[PDB]
């Protein structure tokens, strides 16, 4: 079908765009030795997560849909594990970057001078990935038994389990990001100059990309559709969006991009 | 370790030890905040440097180390040099702030102070360094204004048409003439401050008396604001 | 000035334990790597152990490996050598040597006084052959000493790592020539050195009564360090 | 009046000097060197980048051997580098953080440095204690030190912020000779291949040629329009070059008093911070305030290449005595060695 | 003041000392510089550089 | 080679007029900002007027504003100062100074005790 070919080409295009963006960010980090700051490490972590999800999810997702291809139990389990771990790692990297910005804004004098860090940035980078894994990995590995209609984690039957899972990756992270951005905006306004617009769209894009799936799955479990696919794609497009906002607005990666390009 | 002699690995190890010592020195260097003090012969910067040295504790330079709220400040004052600043001032293009002391009660040499502020503000290499302005000797200025013998309109002909701005929060108990004169003098400097600053660097006008114990707190707050603005500019927030 | 004083020697029973302390005074101790050098009553010097600056790297001889431990106290300016389970082959005099390593450095410049100790009752090695053990000669005439190495001592840097040491009777050896061409500080221009990758020659233009004693060859290519047999020059 | 008579006499003498110089102006240097083949494109690539300085670099100097190097940074550091392996041989902290100059003894046994403090400190490298000490501290200048160059192990010429330059005596610490001829701050000096004469450039747009032994000025060259920030002596010892705040490098001759050639471009509007000559003297390398360095064909005033990219204003530039590599340091914390490609 | 008079006298003496030196033609100086530059052309590794085999920096 | 020669200025009654000229040689007149400074008897050098490269920006000291007018002729390399209604306290030596560097918006050390790029000066005496 022509529609299937066009859809496959569109997913290939978005995967290639993710490839290009994250490869450019990682290349900028690698080439320049000036980007050895903590924020540079956080941006590298986010870029690594987005590059890995672009590598793993979509290319293996092509045969699963609109194609007469089947995936075994091990392959499907690995695909789900990688997808969930990478998504949670991206969310936690976003939260870490927001916390770093909050610390810089509210503790500027100590952020500049009384802030030295080595082998401790890597500690946080490992910790966020470990927590991202522990959110879902053991859960789905146990859920292998509870389940061949569709390659799914198999815990969608339990509503409370889904609520617990969505609580540790969408409610608390959004609350923390909103709290950090609100504190930064309030401190800067007390001390509406296009700062509010950016600090609002930063949370708005994340919420718009992540809420629909995390709520549609819950309401379907409590009581597929095209809107289900739309929500899944909205969740995936956050990985596309992320390279444009965070690493491209730090004034350090911009210098490397200007020099190289 | 490949194709390296037994006497080359030891040299590499010595270099690595030197590098680790350099890292420790870099941490210590980043810990401290450097400032550059500037003033004329009648400015009175000696009193300020003494009061912030002793209380908070031939050669071509003087160094004063103080500490406020567990924050370490290193103030550098040029001495025993010549009267041409266009060559040795480019050394101080990385300091956190330029403290600039101006004698407000000296109308005759106020134009000289304005010219020095203009030249410092618009310099090619000092175009990203904030200035903390100390308008010293407020008591003498108030006494001169109260005396009425000398008129500011003689040196600045636009003072006669200047009226103090409304809602300027005058200090309660101060004469209106003294407040008007002080606000005019600060106006003369904020014009140069905002003429071509463009937000890259800003100026902090302050009034200082003969014996004031709050100068260290003022410097600390101005430095805090300077670092906050630098951090905001780093993340492209503003 | 510069002083290295050793202590801790004595008479011990076989299989016992002992400790030597080498105190360094008059120079920056922390910037110098340290070596222990053992000289038996029989002629010949043997390298024992080495510790770098900051104790980054430690090297031992294949004989004392597993029984000797070398450490250093920089704040106390002291070098420790502890031995356990001694044998009858460890009875000798121990010298404390210092060495600094950079581009133009002069390793093995100063040697300690040394402490004597008596006991009751090979693939990765480079050999040195000094055939002329004893050369008798009246002073005032030129003197030539020859050294040979089984392996070429010339590295890819162009540096040939060969060292010449002088031991006059009753005193620890002092460095004369380092890296086969250079002259150590405080050494008269009478001593000269040259040679190819394998054979090396040391010349004393005008002999004096001071130069009587033993001459020792050494290499610094691979860290197992082998001294020469020792050529004895006498009147 | 006596004052007006003296001024008129000075004007008459200046007119006579200018008339003699114009009389000697037979033909320009550009006219004579016009049939020689141009060099072409001079592409030099970076071979080494040396890191370890915590602030801007103000000075640098090669050793007599073309391997070891010394650099000075205003964080208060004097670092000695083995350029072949990028190793650090020594790292000497300084009493004063403001250091504007650095020198390396021709014997390799000493280094020297000075700055905003009107003191030149000489450090001994070869010590029996294994550490670098402060061998001497020469004081007596009443201004910041701009340059210092070693003559022997026991002699050194310094130029300071005041109008004077001085030849010292390291063993005794007293100025053997004082020159005191300039009007503005002296910013650079260059020793001749045989150390009998040396030139000094200052902030009055004039260069002076002094005789070391007699301590008097021989010739004064005035072709520039602004302060001179650098000077370099021709390899054959019969000419020199000067770079100034205006975007111009001027080549002056000794036997013929006047000026030979001018190196400038329409697109260049910044100042020159340093100049240097190659071993043959055909090329002249000049570092600019726009974070770049230019290579001028000194016999034709044609730019033959650009060393591009240092992230901050280029401060110091030097060429090895062997002529193999060019070392460049900027207000960035890094020092780069550049070499050609066959 | 007498200081200005003394400085003017010193400047006049310096100008008199500088004005009496001998100057060669610019053509001769140009020829000398060109000859020196041509003579040492082969010993300038910054011109037609040496091969990477013998280049100390790589 | 940088030479600035000042002409004009003599005995002038109070309320009179004068015009000082400054001829420049050795440098491109169009690339530098120019200043007029003065030295009163028993007083230090005092900045009195300033004109930019193209004459677009002009500044005065305030005690001469409305009485003094500065101008520059880049075609003939001249700097004019027209002084109107001279006060008895205006007796001083006037120097035509050049800013140290080209294409700069700041000027350093123009009123220094010694300066390489300053003229010899012209005497302006006001008496009655
Ligand atoms: C998904 C699997 C394969 C890897 C999970 C960890 C990844 C995402 C992260 C966690 C910590 C990271 C490391 C932390 C520190 C550094 C800095 C520098 O030394 C090079 C990269 C390196 C070494 C990072 C490489 C990527 C890294 C290993
Ligand atoms: N790709 C969707 C991953 C996820 C996380 N939570 C729910 N779904």
PDB file of C-alpha atoms in Angstrom, chain F residues 11-105:
ATOM      1  CA  UNK F  11      45.813  89.487  23.896  1.00  0.00           C
ATOM      2  CA  UNK F  12      42.008  89.664  23.901  1.00  0.00           C
ATOM      3  CA  UNK F  13      39.660  91.982  25.779  1.00  0.00           C
ATOM      4  CA  UNK F  14      36.828  90.415  27.812  1.00  0.00           C
ATOM      5  CA  UNK F  15      33.892  89.585  25.579  1.00  0.00           C
ATOM      6  CA  UNK F  16      36.185  89.270  22.560  1.00  0.00           C
ATOM      7  CA  UNK F  17      36.658  86.433  20.106  1.00  0.00           C
ATOM      8  CA  UNK F  18      39.486  84.155  19.013  1.00  0.00           C
ATOM      9  CA  UNK F  19      40.075  81.239  16.654  1.00  0.00           C
ATOM     10  CA  UNK F  20      42.782  78.640  17.274  1.00  0.00           C
ATOM     11  CA  UNK F  21      43.947  76.364  14.463  1.00  0.00           C
ATOM     12  CA  UNK F  22      45.819  73.066  14.763  1.00  0.00           C
ATOM     13  CA  UNK F  23      47.591  71.660  11.697  1.00  0.00           C
ATOM     14  CA  UNK F  24      48.352  67.934  11.774  1.00  0.00           C
ATOM     15  CA  UNK F  25      50.988  65.922   9.924  1.00  0.00           C
ATOM     16  CA  UNK F  26      52.430  62.424  10.039  1.00  0.00           C
ATOM     17  CA  UNK F  27      49.101  60.611  10.428  1.00  0.00           C
ATOM     18  CA  UNK F  28      45.747  60.237   8.689  1.00  0.00           C
ATOM     19  CA  UNK F  29      43.600  62.968  10.233  1.00  0.00           C
ATOM     20  CA  UNK F  30      40.325  61.190   9.432  1.00  0.00           C
ATOM     21  CA  UNK F  31      41.012  58.054  11.514  1.00  0.00           C
ATOM     22  CA  UNK F  32      41.464  59.688  14.939  1.00  0.00           C
ATOM     23  CA  UNK F  33      39.321  61.478  17.500  1.00  0.00           C
ATOM     24  CA  UNK F  34      40.632  64.923  18.432  1.00  0.00           C
ATOM     25  CA  UNK F  35      40.561  66.938  21.648  1.00  0.00           C
ATOM     26  CA  UNK F  36      41.349  70.426  22.891  1.00  0.00           C
ATOM     27  CA  UNK F  37      42.899  70.626  26.362  1.00  0.00           C
ATOM     28  CA  UNK F  38      44.164  73.576  28.366  1.00  0.00           C
ATOM     29  CA  UNK F  39      46.587  74.426  31.164  1.00  0.00           C
ATOM     30  CA  UNK F  40      45.815  77.425  33.362  1.00  0.00           C
ATOM     31  CA  UNK F  41      48.563  79.175  35.355  1.00  0.00           C
ATOM     32  CA  UNK F  42      49.211  77.116  38.465  1.00  0.00           C
ATOM     33  CA  UNK F  43      46.741  74.432  37.362  1.00  0.00           C
ATOM     34  CA  UNK F  44      46.851  70.980  35.832  1.00  0.00           C
ATOM     35  CA  UNK F  45      45.942  70.058  32.282  1.00  0.00           C
ATOM     36  CA  UNK F  46      42.178  70.270  31.796  1.00  0.00           C
ATOM     37  CA  UNK F  47      40.113  68.680  29.034  1.00  0.00           C
ATOM     38  CA  UNK F  48      38.010  71.376  27.374  1.00  0.00           C
ATOM     39  CA  UNK F  49      36.601  70.006  24.091  1.00  0.00           C
ATOM     40  CA  UNK F  50      36.316  66.843  22.014  1.00  0.00           C
ATOM     41  CA  UNK F  51      35.306  66.035  18.428  1.00  0.00           C
ATOM     42  CA  UNK F  52      34.921  62.555  16.934  1.00  0.00           C
ATOM     43  CA  UNK F  53      36.255  61.163  13.648  1.00  0.00           C
ATOM     44  CA  UNK F  54      33.609  62.564  11.290  1.00  0.00           C
ATOM     45  CA  UNK F  55      32.469  65.449  13.492  1.00  0.00           C
ATOM     46  CA  UNK F  56      29.142  63.768  14.257  1.00  0.00           C
ATOM     47  CA  UNK F  57      29.796  63.617  18.018  1.00  0.00           C
ATOM     48  CA  UNK F  58      30.958  66.761  19.832  1.00  0.00           C
ATOM     49  CA  UNK F  59      31.484  67.266  23.570  1.00  0.00           C
ATOM     50  CA  UNK F  60      32.421  70.209  25.793  1.00  0.00           C
ATOM     51  CA  UNK F  61      33.487  70.687  29.410  1.00  0.00           C
ATOM     52  CA  UNK F  62      30.348  72.541  30.522  1.00  0.00           C
ATOM     53  CA  UNK F  63      32.103  75.723  31.609  1.00  0.00           C
ATOM     54  CA  UNK F  64      32.707  76.500  27.913  1.00  0.00           C
ATOM     55  CA  UNK F  65      29.435  75.158  26.484  1.00  0.00           C
ATOM     56  CA  UNK F  66      27.642  77.865  24.525  1.00  0.00           C
ATOM     57  CA  UNK F  67      30.842  79.899  24.124  1.00  0.00           C
ATOM     58  CA  UNK F  68      33.281  77.515  22.417  1.00  0.00           C
ATOM     59  CA  UNK F  69      32.742  75.711  19.108  1.00  0.00           C
ATOM     60  CA  UNK F  70      34.999  72.939  17.806  1.00  0.00           C
ATOM     61  CA  UNK F  71      35.308  71.849  14.182  1.00  0.00           C
ATOM     62  CA  UNK F  72      37.565  69.675  12.054  1.00  0.00           C
ATOM     63  CA  UNK F  73      38.504  69.799   8.368  1.00  0.00           C
ATOM     64  CA  UNK F  74      39.636  66.331   7.306  1.00  0.00           C
ATOM     65  CA  UNK F  75      40.236  67.548   3.745  1.00  0.00           C
ATOM     66  CA  UNK F  76      42.954  69.991   4.847  1.00  0.00           C
ATOM     67  CA  UNK F  77      43.859  68.191   8.117  1.00  0.00           C
ATOM     68  CA  UNK F  78      42.964  71.073  10.423  1.00  0.00           C
ATOM     69  CA  UNK F  79      41.289  71.421  13.821  1.00  0.00           C
ATOM     70  CA  UNK F  80      39.521  74.712  14.572  1.00  0.00           C
ATOM     71  CA  UNK F  81      38.352  76.051  17.926  1.00  0.00           C
ATOM     72  CA  UNK F  82      36.303  79.257  17.840  1.00  0.00           C
ATOM     73  CA  UNK F  83      36.114  80.928  21.256  1.00  0.00           C
ATOM     74  CA  UNK F  84      33.445  83.599  21.763  1.00  0.00           C
ATOM     75  CA  UNK F  85      33.007  86.072  24.638  1.00  0.00           C
ATOM     76  CA  UNK F  86      36.181  85.205  26.523  1.00  0.00           C
ATOM     77  CA  UNK F  87      36.096  85.497  30.311  1.00  0.00           C
ATOM     78  CA  UNK F  88      39.005  87.032  32.259  1.00  0.00           C
ATOM     79  CA  UNK F  89      39.718  83.617  33.824  1.00  0.00           C
ATOM     80  CA  UNK F  90      40.270  81.947  30.427  1.00  0.00           C
ATOM     81  CA  UNK F  91      43.980  82.838  30.240  1.00  0.00           C
ATOM     82  CA  UNK F  92      45.753  79.533  29.616  1.00  0.00           C
ATOM     83  CA  UNK F  93      47.891  77.516  27.213  1.00  0.00           C
ATOM     84  CA  UNK F  94      45.774  75.510  24.766  1.00  0.00           C
ATOM     85  CA  UNK F  95      46.941  72.166  23.363  1.00  0.00           C
ATOM     86  CA  UNK F  96      45.511  70.279  20.382  1.00  0.00           C
ATOM     87  CA  UNK F  97      45.703  66.624  21.412  1.00  0.00           C
ATOM     88  CA  UNK F  98      45.117  63.470  19.379  1.00  0.00           C
ATOM     89  CA  UNK F  99      43.548  60.323  20.778  1.00  0.00           C
ATOM     90  CA  UNK F 100      46.146  57.540  21.116  1.00  0.00           C
ATOM     91  CA  UNK F 101      44.624  54.908  18.817  1.00  0.00           C
ATOM     92  CA  UNK F 102      42.486  54.837  15.655  1.00  0.00           C
ATOM     93  CA  UNK F 103      38.918  53.554  15.383  1.00  0.00           C
ATOM     94  CA  UNK F 104      38.370  53.713  19.153  1.00  0.00           C
ATOM     95  CA  UNK F 105      35.480  55.140  21.161  1.00  0.00           C
TER      96      UNK F 105
END
